[PDB]
Task: inverse folding
């Protein structure tokens, strides 16, 4: 009798590289370099697309950011034409403030409990339209209650009851004209001082015309602080002051009671697709150890290499005939 | 549909043998792996063994390394597990579980991919290993003495389980039937209770209906205030 | 040959909140790690495999993560039907091992209602006496029962068991049985169950005198 | 391969063997047959899966790093940031290239090895009852029906049973 020993072969072999040979055919191989993205920055993740919403706007509530005031997110996507503000102004320490928010997890809001006696608090503007002229959702605009009436020296203290450090934002208003300040807040010296156990500073309006944006020569500037638990922020002002109505609490400081921990905030021009590794080209699978898509990455990512392909043999040498 | 059905099991004396079948029905072409996992009531899960292709496993846990042996009959599509030299701690609910692997592994379709996760679990077959000797329960009243509690104590039976209903299943609200406890005699005892309006005691009859199928014993016990 | 330890043994989480579980594993393990949701009276169901890749058609609220040694499992939006027990397995040592198990709870503190039952005359004729103490519909699960016979603390002659959390009201109940011989039971007068529980400002005793009612 | 079986004394692979990687083909009185060897097949597959387990699904988390694209000329510091990243990529590109070349050489050698082991094991089984024809085939010097062939494949072949018949056939004129 005859007994022959042998091995299999396939008609469709794959060429791989070895130590001694540039081109050798094996029965099967797998690709080690990820070379494509689906074109979207992300399935299985909780994501929010701010869209028109600027990110900082989530804190103080322009009409844009109406949906996203109390958002809960694992992944947060900023967008390019987004405007943080309805009435022209800018945040102090702006870039630093966003980085806080991106990694927040989202934000929870609770009222600071402020109440007012003799003032207009319902200040509205052409800039925040919203069915009818309006203001920031999360703040109150304070006015004399009778035009040209000198504004009251007032004091507010709010104390951070919660375990998570609170986020507090306030405004200084620089009026369109020296007149408008007068009409709004009365006349004479205007001083605003903000006091916390780690924080104190004093602000004064410097009223003037500035280039007309959103139809307003006037500006509002936002200053923010982080308040440790059990700490009082004291607000003292004779006017020109935009007041926080609500405190912002991060979700990744929650006690596992709202708690949605640790988000990654990205900047993307791509659509979304719910069908771990992010590149500027879009998210990429991370099953492969290497990738050729982008040297810039975030997350659990394959390592960037220059090769476009690297085949790992997963079968024996292919010897047909 | 990828469900499998476990048949066999029962009460056996320590030192005896017993094999459990697993009818692999459905999507499983049975070129994929299968596994056995046992769990005793009061304990967690524990992987027992696995099978692959033909005789590629040969994969047994250290607890049963020299006792259990795993068979596979692809012609009739049934997985087996011959449990020899059974000890007391072998009493468990043996589950037959499907096995799936990432598609990057499992090069040849038949052989074993050394990284499996179980996806489709079976109904499970309970195997009890004692020197016990089946015995039906005695049923005693827990007599009530706005809301009253009454019940039945079902004592000194073996093996599990027993079923308890009240008023032939007409009384459900407020019933709690507790897990049995195992006494030092090796027999089980459990209680079933119900809370009812105090005002119903005098008009309304309460009867607990106890069924112990292993001994084909059936008891109705009327529970009266005393 | 490669032990798995889950932490904690049981956790209480309000419905809606995120419940993070732990699966610490001796020796490195990354490639294979599977989470399971074994509801009482049912077989385990696969949730996540590998580490983060969830099973087919399972809710997106089940999240998985971890590497090498420390592994976590977070349930985003919790539901009342998630009262199951969760386990984690590992590769490989050619011998897969399971975890110990993590019980998940879903209410207002509630003191037990406590009832004591003397042995029936029927049972006494068979030569034994079971005295039963029932602690009904309490929350949280932690409760202590002590038995006294003529004011002497009993040790070693009781057994207890506790129900699963009740779906209808999120409470637990507990039955304890004190077992005496007939001769011993008839030698003593006062039988008492003393119950300690967070919902009770002081421990509660229910008792009876043998041969009185 | 370094053992000289695959692409060596075994002239070519069998496309018609689709139930295993290694196996037996026989010709006897009852006909011609083919059967896979599961143990050697699984031994090769287990080793390859061991390699895959080291490479697949084990990436490492990075978060905040350095910038790697720049919109303005800055000189010194930007030169340094670019050089650091370029250095890192070349070193990882090297690691990846060598890893694949090394693993592949080894995979081809281990699969050749498994084939050789099966051949050597079979040779020892047959003792004095067969001769190596030099192409992976044994000439068996006795009547060997299907059950006999089967006994060789499953390791229950008793050479003493056939030895007298075999020796007479081998050593004659």
Result:
């Amino acid at each position: 009798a005859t007994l022959c020993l042998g091995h299999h072969a396939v008609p469709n072999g794959t060429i791989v590289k070895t130590i001694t040979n540039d081109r050798i055919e094996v029965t099967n191989a797998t690709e080690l370099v990820q070379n494509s993205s689906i074109g979207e920055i992300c399935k299985g993740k909780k994501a929010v697309d701010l869209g028109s919403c600027g990110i900082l706007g989530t804190i103080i509530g322009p009409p844009q950011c109406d949906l996203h005031l109390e958002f809960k997110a694992d992944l947060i996507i900023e967008r390019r034409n987004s405007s943080d503000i309805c009435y022209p102004g800018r945040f102090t320490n702006e870039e630093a403030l966003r980085q806080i928010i991106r990694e927040s997890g989202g934000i929870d809001k609770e009222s600071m409990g402020f109440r007012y006696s003799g003032i207009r608090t319902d200040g509205a503007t052409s800039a925040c339209k919203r069915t009818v002229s309006s203001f920031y959702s999360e703040m109150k605009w304070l006015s004399s209650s009778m035009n040209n009436q000198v504004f009251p020296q007032l004091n507010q203290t709010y104390r951070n009851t919660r375990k998570e450090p609170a986020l507090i934002v306030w405004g200084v208003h620089h009026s369109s004209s020296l007149d408008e300040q007068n009409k709004l807040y009365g006349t004479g010296n205007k001083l605003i001082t903000v006091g916390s156990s780690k924080y104190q500073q004093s602000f004064s309006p410097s009223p003037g015309a500035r280039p007309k944006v959103n139809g307003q020569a006037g500006r509002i500037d936002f200053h923010w602080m982080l308040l440790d638990p059990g700490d009082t922020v004291t607000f003292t002002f004779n006017g020109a002051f935009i007041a926080p109505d609500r405190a912002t609490f991060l979700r990744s400081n929650a006690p596992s009671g709202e708690y949605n921990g640790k988000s990654l905030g990205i900047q993307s021009d791509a659509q979304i697709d719910e069908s771990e590794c992010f590149t500027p080209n879009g998210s990429i699978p991370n099953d492969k150890p290497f990738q050729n898509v982008n040297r810039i990455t975030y997350g659990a990512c394959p390592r960037y290499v220059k090769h476009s392909t690297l085949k790992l043999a997963t079968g024996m040498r292919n010897v047909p005939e | 549909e990828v469900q499998l059905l476990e048949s066999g099991g029962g009460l056996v004396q320590p030192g005896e043998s017993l094999r459990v079948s697993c009818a692999a029905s459905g999507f499983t072409f049975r070129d994929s792996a299968l596994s056995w996992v046992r769990q005793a009531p009061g304990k967690g899960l524990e992987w027992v063994s696995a099978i692959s292709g033909n005789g590629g496993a040969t994969y047994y846990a250290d607890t049963v390394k020299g006792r259990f042996t795993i068979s596979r009959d692809n012609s009739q599509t049934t997985l087996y597990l011959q449990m020899n030299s059974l000890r007391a701690d072998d009493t468990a609910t043996y589950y037959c579980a499907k096995d799936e692997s990432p598609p990057i592994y499992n090069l040849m379709p038949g052989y074993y991919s050394t990284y499996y996760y179980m996806d489709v679990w079976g109904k499970g077959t309970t195997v009890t290993v004692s020197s016990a000797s089946t015995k039906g329960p005695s049923v005693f009243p827990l007599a009530p003495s706005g809301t009253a509690a009454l019940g039945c104590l079902v004592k000194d039976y073996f093996p599990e389980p027993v079923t308890v209903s009240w008023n032939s299943g007409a009384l459900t609200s407020g019933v709690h039937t507790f897990p049995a406890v195992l006494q030092s005699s090796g027999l089980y005892s459990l209680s079933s209770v119900v809370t009812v309006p105090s005002s119903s005691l005098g008009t309304q009859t309460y009867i607990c209906n106890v069924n112990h199928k292993p001994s084909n014993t059936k008891v109705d016990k009327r529970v009266e205030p005393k | 040959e490669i032990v798995m330890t889950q932490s904690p043994v049981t956790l209480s989480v309000s419905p809606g909140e995120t419940a993070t579980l732990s699966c610490r594993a001796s020796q490195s393990v990354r490639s294979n790690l599977a989470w399971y949701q074994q509801k009482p009276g049912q077989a385990p169901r696969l949730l996540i495999y590998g580490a983060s890749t969830r099973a087919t058609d399972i809710p997106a609220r089940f999240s998985g993560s971890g590497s090498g040694t420390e592994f976590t499992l977070s349930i985003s939006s919790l539901q009342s039907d998630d009262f199951a027990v969760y386990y984690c397995q590992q590769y490989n040592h050619w011998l897969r091992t399971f975890g110990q198990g993590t019980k998940l709870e879903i209410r207002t503190v509630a003191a037990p209602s406590v009832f004591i039952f003397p042995p029936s005359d029927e049972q006494l004729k068979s030569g034994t006496a079971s005295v039963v103490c029932l602690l009904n519909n309490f929350y949280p699960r932690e409760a202590k029962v002590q038995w006294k016979v003529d004011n002497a603390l009993q040790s070693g002659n009781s057994q207890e068991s506790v129900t699963e959390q009740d779906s209808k009201d999120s409470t637990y109940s507990l039955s304890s049985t004190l077992t005496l011989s007939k001769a011993d039971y008839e030698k003593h007068k006062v039988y008492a169950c003393e119950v300690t529980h967070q919902g009770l400002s002081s421990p509660v005793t229910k008792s009876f005198n043998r041969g009185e009612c | 391969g370094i053992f000289g079986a695959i692409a060596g004394f075994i002239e070519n692979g069998w496309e018609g063997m689709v139930d295993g990687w290694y196996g037996f083909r026989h010709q006897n009185s009852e006909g011609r047959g083919q059967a896979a060897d599961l143990k050697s097949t699984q031994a090769a597959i287990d080793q390859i899966n061991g390699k895959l387990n080291r490479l697949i699904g084990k990436t490492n988390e990075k978060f905040h790093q350095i910038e790697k694209e720049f919109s303005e000329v800055e000189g010194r510091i930007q030169d340094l940031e670019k050089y650091v990243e370029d250095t890192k990529i070349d070193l990882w590109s090297y690691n990846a290239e060598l890893l694949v070349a090394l693993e592949n050489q080894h995979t081809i050698d281990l699969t050749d090895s498994e084939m050789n082991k099966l051949f050597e094991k079979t040779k020892k089984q047959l003792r004095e009852n067969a001769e190596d024809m030099g192409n992976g085939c044994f000439k068996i010097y006795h009547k060997c029906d299907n059950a006999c062939i089967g006994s060789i494949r499953n390791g229950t072949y008793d050479h003493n049973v056939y030895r007298d018949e075999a020796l007479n056939n081998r050593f004659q004129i």
